[PDB]
Write an enzyme that holds these catalytic residues in place. Structure first.
Site, PDB file in Angstrom:
ATOM      1  N   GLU C 153       0.945  -1.320   0.305  1.00  0.00           N
ATOM      2  CA  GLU C 153      -0.311  -0.129  -0.308  1.00  0.00           C
ATOM      3  C   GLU C 153       0.731   0.879  -0.088  1.00  0.00           C
ATOM      4  O   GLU C 153       0.778   1.972   0.965  1.00  0.00           O
ATOM      5  CB  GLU C 153      -1.048  -0.358   1.021  1.00  0.00           C
ATOM      6  CG  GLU C 153      -1.943  -0.876   1.614  1.00  0.00           C
ATOM      7  CD  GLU C 153      -3.133  -1.096   0.767  1.00  0.00           C
ATOM      8  OE1 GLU C 153      -3.544  -0.237  -0.476  1.00  0.00           O
ATOM      9  OE2 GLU C 153      -4.567  -1.716   0.617  1.00  0.00           O
ATOM     10  N   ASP C 154       2.081   1.342  -1.278  1.00  0.00           N
ATOM     11  CA  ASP C 154       2.371   2.499  -1.397  1.00  0.00           C
ATOM     12  C   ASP C 154       3.204   2.436  -0.334  1.00  0.00           C
ATOM     13  O   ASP C 154       3.689   3.816   0.382  1.00  0.00           O
ATOM     14  CB  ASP C 154       2.067   3.616  -1.297  1.00  0.00           C
ATOM     15  CG  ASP C 154       0.604   3.604  -2.580  1.00  0.00           C
ATOM     16  OD1 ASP C 154       1.036   3.050  -3.582  1.00  0.00           O
ATOM     17  OD2 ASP C 154      -0.231   4.928  -2.603  1.00  0.00           O
ATOM     18  N   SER C 155       4.010   1.570   0.173  1.00  0.00           N
ATOM     19  CA  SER C 155       5.525   1.870   1.297  1.00  0.00           C
ATOM     20  C   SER C 155       6.431   0.876   0.393  1.00  0.00           C
ATOM     21  O   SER C 155       6.552   0.547  -0.397  1.00  0.00           O
ATOM     22  CB  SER C 155       5.662   0.642   1.906  1.00  0.00           C
ATOM     23  OG  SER C 155       4.062   1.841   3.008  1.00  0.00           O
ATOM     24  N   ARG C 326      -1.858   2.479 -11.461  1.00  0.00           N
ATOM     25  CA  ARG C 326      -1.173   3.396 -11.588  1.00  0.00           C
ATOM     26  C   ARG C 326      -1.019   3.611 -13.387  1.00  0.00           C
ATOM     27  O   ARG C 326      -0.982   4.744 -13.481  1.00  0.00           O
ATOM     28  CB  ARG C 326      -0.385   4.052 -11.050  1.00  0.00           C
ATOM     29  CG  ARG C 326      -0.053   4.739  -9.207  1.00  0.00           C
ATOM     30  CD  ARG C 326      -1.356   3.729  -8.465  1.00  0.00           C
ATOM     31  NE  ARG C 326      -1.210   4.247  -7.273  1.00  0.00           N
ATOM     32  CZ  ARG C 326      -0.665   4.233  -6.282  1.00  0.00           C
ATOM     33  NH1 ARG C 326       0.435   3.665  -6.327  1.00  0.00           N
ATOM     34  NH2 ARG C 326      -0.754   5.317  -5.448  1.00  0.00           N
TER      35      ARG C 326
END
Ligand SMILES: [Mg+2]
Ligand SMILES: [Zn+2]
Ligand SMILES: [Zn+2]
Ligand SMILES: [Zn+2]
Lengths: 432, 48, 466, 181, 59, 59, 115, 44, 66, 258, 48, 29, 78
Positions: C153-155, C326
């Site tokens: 999750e976007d880490s 994305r």
RNA sequence: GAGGGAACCCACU
């Protein structure tokens, strides 16, 4: 002074917050009642709020810079209210849509799609390592699905150990064929796409978002309905730990080689784009020579727009279908799509085959100049390239006109988010 | 004025009675932890 | 004209001579609506159906439609447009070297990276933004892989051994200004080293680190409860009271510089720059040049990170799931081109609309250097040594350290300062304030049914009164 | 019950929302009690009839013995009792589900406990729950308007809707040919 | 700093890469953001909606 | 009753932020406006205004 | 701010036991060895060495949290054998392995340096 | 105490309430000496 | 600003190579050949010297306060 | 006793790297040996910096970090050097630390390159590696800039800080022809062969070996200069053996305590 | 609704106010429920 | 003589470099 | 004569557990045998499971009347 | 063992 360090019965000690303390944990905007849930405190040696991944869905949270709030209940009544009312396992299933709010997310999801496939075989050391991370394990190593030539366990056996109690659930994988249930192999799936869990044992099927996600009738939903909140909490934790430790062996990536298609596929995509552009030119010639018949309920320009958009949508759909048909079983875009973890077939289509038509306010790219979208086109150019159809993929790269039209398209989504937040929040406040 | 004191989302009622600053609250950036259970939050030692 | 411009500082031929030659001309938006633009000179040199035979102008280069911040994006035409917007936002938050004379300046907020690198994959438009001379970021060996679940999750997972070697280490500079002021004849603020039996209302802090001019010296370690400027104001036995300038709380550091001067109206004016070294941490924000923001989730040492057969460990591991929705394919192409660039010994060209650069050409160039043509490598598990079954996309990608550290955002309050009017807790971490239990939180706790928690938050954790 | 159902659901949509998942609990009883579906069962059909009758008696939403209370209780559990008699039919329980006597008794007890666990608790702030349940999907939202502007035109009773419209249905042969339409 | 070489700017403790284009007001660097406006002296004809005017010309 | 934010404190966190702030244009239409047309990326912005660089949120 | 000292990954503080043995009550002849201030190095070699012992029915290790420095090794043996005995014999076999490897590496270095 | 002049690099003794001016070149911007206190850096 | 002592990825010494690399580039080497002559085989060590911006030279053009 | 009997084949031994092959051992043993190469081989590196004067353009923590990353020769002296946590001295002594001093003033119009040659140690057995290649650039000074500092170097390993990591690159490999299918190639013909591959050019991958296990492991241990690479491998074997012996001692004490 | 060969049973509007003024309060309750359900379930979203 | 397409990229970035050598980036202010 | 539900609601369970925990924390007599645990919440929950909490829930009807239910009189189903 | 408010701007999710 030590004379002030004396404790009597009835005194209060304002002690530091420690392990096991109950807190309310919150992320703005607090939209539904599961954006504020009770958590047990564990002290960890860095400066952030560590959060479980399945919990990120009811908070609408990710870790791209999100800050969250933590309220400490100060009395035993408020602590027991949060413990018996607002804990995360009690908030697993919502009354909004009678379905779970939190499910298995992204790597646990991708690798449980990869882990419950038929050809997944684990050796004795791998099985023992995975059973180290099963907190509900009873200590008995199951008999392997294959005993000779070598003892091998399947991933379905280990997930059967993960599945709690005696859950009985029937689901379908996202790649389940439509005509398979009517065929001769309904109860023996050739592609392992019918999920059957019986007596808490994953008998067959590949698990995905349709089985382990936040949908109604999913495996975590049946676990909540049959086993309660604590056993389902252990279920979530065990899925995450065991699958995340098998993913160390298996691994998952995304690369530039997942964006490549075959040369035959590229030829098919170019042929489809060429044929569709020829069809758009033919419709343009029919409209220009006054041979275009208007449809009922619409004027001539809007029937022309409907015809052109039908042709270009057929182009984008056919090129995308060829793009997914090119994809191997090792493709990681396909892995994350059929796992339901991230992305869609539209994303694969745009990366590999065709980005597609750019739209502003539901129509094609407007004539912001005098009858021209850009000064690089001629006047009254109604063709696909002029009015915002991007015939390239993200791998191929956009032409400058396509880049500008794609920026025009994405600015619409940014505007929609920014101006819809305030009206939606006012609607929520008035409803409350 | 007093009317401006009372009205609005920053006024007395909405900004100080329906919602208000609280003690015993902490705020910081969130990071993942697959090793915590779903009912468990990792807390920095300074906040605690 | 091109030959004359190749010797600009010899012929004295310039851009203005090119304008005077009748070669280029300035067209505004109203005139552009009447011109006929060729996108490239290939539109001019076209055969029997050129789609237009009446071109009046030609674009010098189409990639010049971007601004300053969008011109540092490599392969911007391979990305989704909102991701280019997000990178245009975050390139202004990236810490590098913001100016060369930063030692002279005392800005209130200043941020200097230790080792800023120029990108291995640049655009030609970056040659005029001076990004080669003042870069903001480091080329990082990035592996796009799911490793231990801590990049979800976007880490990102960072290499702790890399961080120990100065990878993305930065310096925070904070300046504090104070001045004596004669606000009336009797009132006289003065920079003095205060004395406990003489000054009224001290903040129970130490004052020994001040010199006898009332100012702390450069090179002195300071903490959140420390006096750096000792200013006393005369009270009209406590003839003067304490109005000393304090360091901002939890911002430990070292006094970098102290400057004493005169203001416009001729009073003593002190500016103190305090320096603090920011080592990368869990929760620090990092972004590639493609809208791939994300906080550091964990840091593993070199023996824990996955490694290639050459012993290369990634500096940063990002999640694969950051890519598909994305569609930041320019990130993947920048990583591939950076692998080619670092092997070849050259700076890769990622000008947007360039047919000389293609994914197939970069793939063949990479396969010419003994690597798999798609940038994948066989990685081995750091913990067990076993090969990862999948092959991991890994290579150099330009990353940026964003200004948003977790230590500038972490804030807790038990009890403390309250407002004068409503007697509720204060605002922000800078004033030891409380968090707002807003109306939406009140609605959520109504829906929970937790009335005693609602009463605790809205009555006796905020402002009890009788 | 079938006629009542076809009055209630005239579109023939059999997907309903009901408290107790009867098919899953029948499967649970089959797995728990080791029901062999290829052997004859020891469950009398009259045991099924009488057990469903007493179970429907003891699934109470509206208390009371007055005719108003009895009518309200019959109305509140009408769909669930129809689905219960449809699912625990003696014919279906004998030849399709094949449950034993102890399996059927456990099924009745499980249905009763799961129904009593489903009743709304007094103290439930269901208005705030409803307002959050209709505002949270709003964050994720012929030229007929839909989405957030239509939601605004609905909850604000607008005398001037953006796209007002009718759906006119035709009677008889007028609906069957395009010329008289 | 006008007309100064990079060596003269470094001797004055100025960055030669610094663009200028800003002011120093009370020691604070202030930039004037450019402001969009409708063009002057040009006739623009619009159609005002939900008003008494079918069309309007504006200069 | 005067327009605010014409003069801003110059961003000095990066050289790119300094350049971007020195080349910044502003539509003085109120950010509370919920109409999309001034916020839209117009066709006539080609080569004049960057199509990617815009803030997120109300502006 | 909340950064732990870097020596805390390998240094036992005062009162911290190195290895603690707990009987695992789920199944007979099973023990959990909690080893403090160690990591995947010793856990991996000891687990793989225990997997070579035919009287060991289960051998596994885990790091319960990577931000803590703690190994849990679960060992289950046959009833005629002990998990403590298995763990000790695994350590003894690993020590003999490393002694033999050390002397053979020294011999190979001498042979490579002489020519 | 001792302040370095910003322009002329020279050290100057300045007492309290003395206006901050360099006695050599009349420059008004002056800087404090680096401290004599003993500061330890870990080389990390 | 100045060349790092270690390669960030592996920890090979690259702090003694910047002046040698500049001398090789002055001696008409290509960048790849200059990196190969210095023994930088891994591309992680090659990005240290290839992408280095030596800002300390321009910082040395300012007269020191101390 | 079910110990392996591993064998060593050195294939290359330079002053910078050792290439060797370990046969007849387990994958966990090989990986733990690699992890001790990176993390748990003690060397001597600067860990304590007191800067007396710093007029340079680089601030004091920057200089200290660069000094810490400079490798120091640790052969035969790190074995007899004590950890500062285990030493009987108050702060520092020659039994647990090495003193370094640096005193460089630039008085010339040429830029002075303060390098690791300017680090003057009080112990001749512990010097900078480049002072036995160019010297590691610490800082550059202009005229009027100065740098005086006193440092202390102490024992430590790479588990604490990466400045104590003695290896540059530990290349580790096993099963180069992929007979065990521990990695699965979607297209095996797209993949370059290993340096240790034993396949013909027409073949892309070995046949599957169902009875096979990882049994032969290839190392290229590259040294950063603090120790010789063979000293790194010998010290890693000694350190792993000492960790196992200490764990066995604590285990025996725990067994006897219950 | 009054027109010939128009179904006077199933014919309905999307205007809430005229449904209230023509058919009453329970009919506009049902119409409100139908229109809210249409808005919610356009996306395939389900609310109880 | 006309600029050949193989020299066009180099020529156009030459003229862009000339433009930014004269005008810079803050010429409007 | 009591028409309300015979089951203890989730809000009733939460408030009875909190109130009994506060009373035990203020040294009320413990109604059950405790096996050497300290936390008043755990003692309150094992008193509730033993159905020995000496608390009467007064449930108010909308007409203004009320019903008094013992904690030992209600069904703790959740 | 803790003495301003207000306005505006930038930014974050
Ligand atoms: Mg976010
Ligand atoms: Zn002077
Ligand atoms: Zn390297
Ligand atoms: Zn000592």
């Amino acid at each position: 002074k030590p004379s002030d360090l004396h404790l009597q019965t009835g005194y209060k000690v304002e002690r530091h917050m420690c392990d096991g303390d109950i807190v309310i944990f919150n992320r703005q905007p607090t939209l539904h009642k599961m954006s504020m849930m009770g958590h047990r405190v564990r002290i960890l040696p860095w400066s952030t709020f560590r959060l479980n991944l399945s919990v990120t869905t009811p908070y609408n949270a990710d870790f791209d810079g999100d800050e969250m709030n933590l309220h400490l209940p100060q009395s035993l009544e408020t602590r027991a209210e949060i413990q018996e009312l607002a804990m995360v396992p009690r908030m697993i299933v919502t009354p909004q849509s009678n379905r779970p709010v939190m499910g298995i997310v992204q790597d646990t999801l991708t690798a449980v799609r990869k882990f419950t496939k038929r050809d997944v075989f684990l050796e004795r050391g791998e099985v023992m390592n995975l059973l180290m991370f099963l907190s509900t394990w009873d200590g008995k190593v199951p008999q392997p699905a294959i005993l000779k030539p070598r003892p091998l366990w399947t991933g379905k056996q280990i997930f059967s150990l993960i599945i709690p109690g005696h859950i009985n659930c029937i689901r379908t994988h996202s790649t389940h064929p439509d005509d398979e249930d009517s065929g001769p192999y309904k109860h023996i799936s050739p592609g392992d796409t019918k999920v059957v869990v019986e007596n808490g044992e994953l008998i067959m099927g590949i698990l995905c978002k349709k089985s382990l996600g936040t949908s109604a009738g999913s495996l975590v939903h049946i676990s909540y309905l049959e086993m309660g909140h604590d056993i389902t909490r252990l279920f979530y934790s065990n899925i995450q730990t065991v699958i995340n430790n098998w993913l160390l062996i298996e691994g998952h990536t995304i690369g530039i080689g997942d964006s490549i298609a075959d040369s035959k596929t590229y030829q098919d995509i170019q042929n489809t784009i060429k044929k569709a552009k020829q069809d758009v030119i033919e419709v343009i010639e029919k409209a220009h020579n006054n041979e275009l018949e208007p449809t009922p309920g619409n004027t001539l320009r809007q029937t022309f727009e409907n015809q052109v958009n039908r042709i270009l949508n057929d182009a984008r759909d056919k090129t995308g279908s060829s793009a997914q048909k090119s994809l191997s079983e090792y493709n990681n875009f396909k892995s994350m799509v059929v796992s339901g973890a991230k992305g869609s077939k539209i994303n694969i289509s745009q990366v590999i085959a065709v980005v597609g038509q750019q739209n502003v306010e539901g129509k094609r790219i407007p004539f912001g100049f005098k009858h021209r979208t850009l000064p690089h086109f001629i006047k009254d150019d109604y063709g696909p390239e002029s009015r915002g159809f991007v015939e390239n993929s993200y791998l191929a790269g956009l032409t400058p006109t396509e880049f500008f039209f794609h920026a025009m398209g994405g600015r619409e989504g940014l505007i929609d988010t920014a101006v819809k937040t305030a009206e939606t929040g006012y609607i929520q406040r008035r409803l409350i | 004025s007093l009317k401006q004191r009372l009205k609005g989302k920053e006024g007395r009622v909405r900004g100080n009675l329906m919602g208000k600053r609280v003690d015993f609250s902490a705020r910081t950036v969130i990071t993942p932890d697959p090793n915590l259970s779903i009912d468990q939050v990792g807390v920095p030692r300074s906040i605690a | 004209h091109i030959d004359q411009l190749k010797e600009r500082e010899y012929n004295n031929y310039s851009w203005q001579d090119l304008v005077a030659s009748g070669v280029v001309e300035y067209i505004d938006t109203l005139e552009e609506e009447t011109v006929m633009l060729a996108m490239t000179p290939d539109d001019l040199q076209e055969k029997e159906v050129a789609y237009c035979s009446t071109y009046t102008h030609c674009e010098i280069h189409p990639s010049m439609i971007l601004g300053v911040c969008a011109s540092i994006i490599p392969f911007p035409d391979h990305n989704q447009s909102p991701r280019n917007t997000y990178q245009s936002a975050m390139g202004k938050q990236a810490m590098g070297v913001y100016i060369t004379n930063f030692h002279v300046r005392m800005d209130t907020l200043a941020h200097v990276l230790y080792y800023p690198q120029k990108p291995l994959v640049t655009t030609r438009s970056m040659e005029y933004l001076r990004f080669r001379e003042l870069p903001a970021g480091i080329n990082s060996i990035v592996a796009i892989a799911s490793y231990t679940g801590y990049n979800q999750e976007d880490s990102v997972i960072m290499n702790r051994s890399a961080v120990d070697r100065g990878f993305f280490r930065s310096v925070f500079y904070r300046s504090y200004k104070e001045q004596e002021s004669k606000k009336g004849f009797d009132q006289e603020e003065v920079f003095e080293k205060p004395t406990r039996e003489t000054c009224q209302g001290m903040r129970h802090a130490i004052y020994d680190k001040l010199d006898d001019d009332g100012l702390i010296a450069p090179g002195v370690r300071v903490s959140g409860d420390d006096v750096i400027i000792g200013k006393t104001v005369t009270l009209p036995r406590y003839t003067k009271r304490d109005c000393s300038t304090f360091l901002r709380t939890s911002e430990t550091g070292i006094v970098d510089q102290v400057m004493v001067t005169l203001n416009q109206e001729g009073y003593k004016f002190c500016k103190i720059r305090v320096r603090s070294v920011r080592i990368p941490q869990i929760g620090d924000k990092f972004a590639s040049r493609h809208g791939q923001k994300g906080t550091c989730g964990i840091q593993y040492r070199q023996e824990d990170m996955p490694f290639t057969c050459e012993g290369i460990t990634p500096d940063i591991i990002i999640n694969p799931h950051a890519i598909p929705s994305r569609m930041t394919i320019g990130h993947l192409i920048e990583c591939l081109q950076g692998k080619v660039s670092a092997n070849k010994g050259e700076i890769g060209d990622a000008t947007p609309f360039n047919d000389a650069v293609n994914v197939q050409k970069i793939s063949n160039l990479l396969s010419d250097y003994g690597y798999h043509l798609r940038g994948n490598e066989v990685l081995y598990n750091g913990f067990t040594g076993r090969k990862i079954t999948s092959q991991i996309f890994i290579g150099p990608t330009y990353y940026q350290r964003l200004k948003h550290m977790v230590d500038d955002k972490i804030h807790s309050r038990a009890r403390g300062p309250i407002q004068i009017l409503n007697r509720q807790p204060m605002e922000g971490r800078s004033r030891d304030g409380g968090l707002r239990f807003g109306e939406m939180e009140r609605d959520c706790q109504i829906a929970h049914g937790a009335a005693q928690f609602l009463r605790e938050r809205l009555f006796e954790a905020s402002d009890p009164y009788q | 019950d079938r006629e009542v159902l076809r009055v209630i659901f005239p579109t023939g949509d059999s997907k309903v929302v009901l408290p107790c998942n009867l098919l899953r609990m029948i499967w649970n009883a089959q797995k728990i009690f080791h029901i062999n579906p290829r052997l004859p069962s020891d469950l009398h059909p009259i045991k099924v009839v009488e057990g469903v009758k007493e179970l429907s008696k003891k699934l109470v939403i509206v208390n009371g013995d007055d005719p108003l209370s009895r009518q309200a209780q019959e109305n509140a559990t009408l769909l669930f009792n129809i689905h219960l008699r449809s699912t625990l039919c003696s014919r279906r329980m004998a030849e399709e589900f094949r449950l034993s006597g102890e399996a059927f008794d456990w099924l009745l007890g499980e249905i009763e406990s799961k129904f009593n666990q489903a009743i709304a608790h007094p103290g439930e702030m269901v208005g705030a729950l409803a307002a959050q349940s209709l505002g949270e999907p709003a964050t994720q939202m012929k030229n007929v308007t839909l989405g957030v502007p239509r939601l605004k035109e609905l909850i604000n009773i607008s005398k001037k809707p953006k796209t007002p419209s009718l759906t006119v249905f035709l009677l008889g042969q007028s609906a069957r040919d395009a010329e008289r339409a | 700093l006008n007309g100064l070489t990079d060596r003269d700017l470094c001797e004055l403790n100025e960055c030669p890469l610094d663009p200028g284009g800003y002011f120093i007001i009370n020691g604070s660097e202030k930039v004037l953001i450019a402001q969009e406006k409708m063009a002057t002296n040009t006739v623009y004809v619009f159609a005002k909606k939900d008003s008494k005017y079918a069309y309007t010309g504006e200069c | 009753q005067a327009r605010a934010g014409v003069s801003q404190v110059l961003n000095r966190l990066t050289f790119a932020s300094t350049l971007s702030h020195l080349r910044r244009l502003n539509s003085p239409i109120g950010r509370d406006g919920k109409l999309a047309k001034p916020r839209q990326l117009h066709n006539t912005l080609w080569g004049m205004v960057c199509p990617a660089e815009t803030p997120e949120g109300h502006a | 701010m909340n950064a732990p000292p870097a020596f805390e990954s390998f240094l036992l503080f005062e009162g911290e036991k190195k290895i603690t043995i707990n009987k695992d009550t789920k199944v007979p002849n099973a023990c959990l060895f909690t080893i403090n201030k160690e990591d995947h190095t010793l856990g991996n070699i000891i687990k793989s060495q225990l997997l070579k012992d035919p009287q060991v029915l289960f051998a596994g290790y885990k790091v319960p949290h990577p931000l803590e420095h703690k190994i849990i090794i679960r060992v289950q043996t046959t009833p005629d054998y002990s998990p403590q005995e298995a763990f000790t014999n695994a350590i003894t076999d690993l020590i003999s392995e490393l002694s033999l490897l050390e002397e053979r590496f020294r011999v190979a270095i001498k042979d490579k340096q002489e020519g | 105490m001792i302040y370095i002049c910003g322009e002329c690099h020279t050290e100057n003794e300045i007492k309290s309430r003395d206006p901050i001016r360099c006695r050599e070149c009349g420059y008004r911007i002056m800087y404090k000496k680096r401290t004599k206190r003993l500061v330890v850096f870990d080389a990390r | 600003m100045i060349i790092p002592v270690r390669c960030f990825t592996c920890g090979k010494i690259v702090g003694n190579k910047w002046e040698a690399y500049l001398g090789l580039l002055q001696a008409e080497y290509t960048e790849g050949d200059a990196l190969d002559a210095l023994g930088l085989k891994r591309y992680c060590c090659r990005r240290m010297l290839l992408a280095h911006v030596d800002l300390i030279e321009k910082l040395l053009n300012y007269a020191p306060l101390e | 006793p079910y110990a392996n009997q591993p064998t060593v084949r050195i294939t290359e031994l330079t002053d910078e790297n050792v290439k060797f092959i370990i046969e007849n051992t387990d994958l966990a043993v090989a990986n733990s040996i690699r992890r001790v190469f990176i993390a748990e081989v003690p060397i001597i590196a600067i860990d304590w910096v007191q800067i007396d004067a710093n007029s340079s353009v680089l601030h004091d923590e920057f200089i200290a970090h660069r000094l810490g990353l400079i490798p120091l020769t640790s052969d035969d002296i790190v074995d007899k050097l004590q950890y500062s946590r285990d030493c009987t001295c108050e702060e520092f002594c020659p039994e647990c630390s090495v003193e370094f001093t640096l005193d460089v003033r630039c008085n010339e119009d040429q830029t002075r390159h303060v390098t690791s040659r300017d680090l003057i140690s009080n112990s001749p057995r512990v010097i900078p590696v480049t002072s036995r290649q160019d010297d590691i650039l610490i800082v550059k000074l202009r005229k009027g800039q100065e740098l005086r500092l006193r440092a202390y170097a102490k024992k430590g390993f790479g588990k604490e800080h990466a400045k104590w990591n003695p290896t540059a690159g530990v290349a580790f490999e096993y099963d180069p022809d992929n007979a065990l299918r521990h990695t699965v190639y979607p297209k095996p013909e797209e993949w370059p062969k290993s340096e240790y591959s034993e396949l013909d050019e027409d073949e892309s991958q070995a046949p599957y070996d169902p009875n096979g296990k990882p049994e032969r492991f290839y190392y290229n241990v590259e040294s950063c200069g603090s120790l010789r690479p063979e000293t790194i491998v010998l010290s890693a074997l000694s350190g792993l053996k000492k960790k196992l012996s200490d764990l066995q001692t604590q285990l025996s004490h725990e067994i006897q305590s219950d | 609704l009054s027109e010939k060969d128009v179904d006077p049973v199933r014919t309905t509007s999307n205007d809430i106010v005229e449904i209230f003024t023509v058919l009453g309060i329970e009919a506009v309750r049902k119409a409100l429920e139908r229109e809210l359900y249409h808005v919610i379930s356009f996306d395939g979203s389900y609310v109880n | 003589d006309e600029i050949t397409p193989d020299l066009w990229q180099e020529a156009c970035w030459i003229v862009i470099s000339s433009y930014f050598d004269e005008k810079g980036l803050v010429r409007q202010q | 004569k009591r028409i309300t539900t015979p089951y203890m609601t989730k809000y009733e369970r939460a408030r009875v557990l909190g109130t009994r925990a506060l009373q035990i924390a203020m040294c009320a007599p413990v109604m059950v045998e405790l096996e050497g645990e300290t936390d008043p919440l755990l003692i309150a929950m094992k008193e509730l499971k033993a159905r020995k909490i000496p608390i009467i829930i007064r449930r108010y009807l909308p007409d203004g009347s009320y019903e008094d239910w013992g904690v030992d009189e209600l069904i703790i189903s959740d």
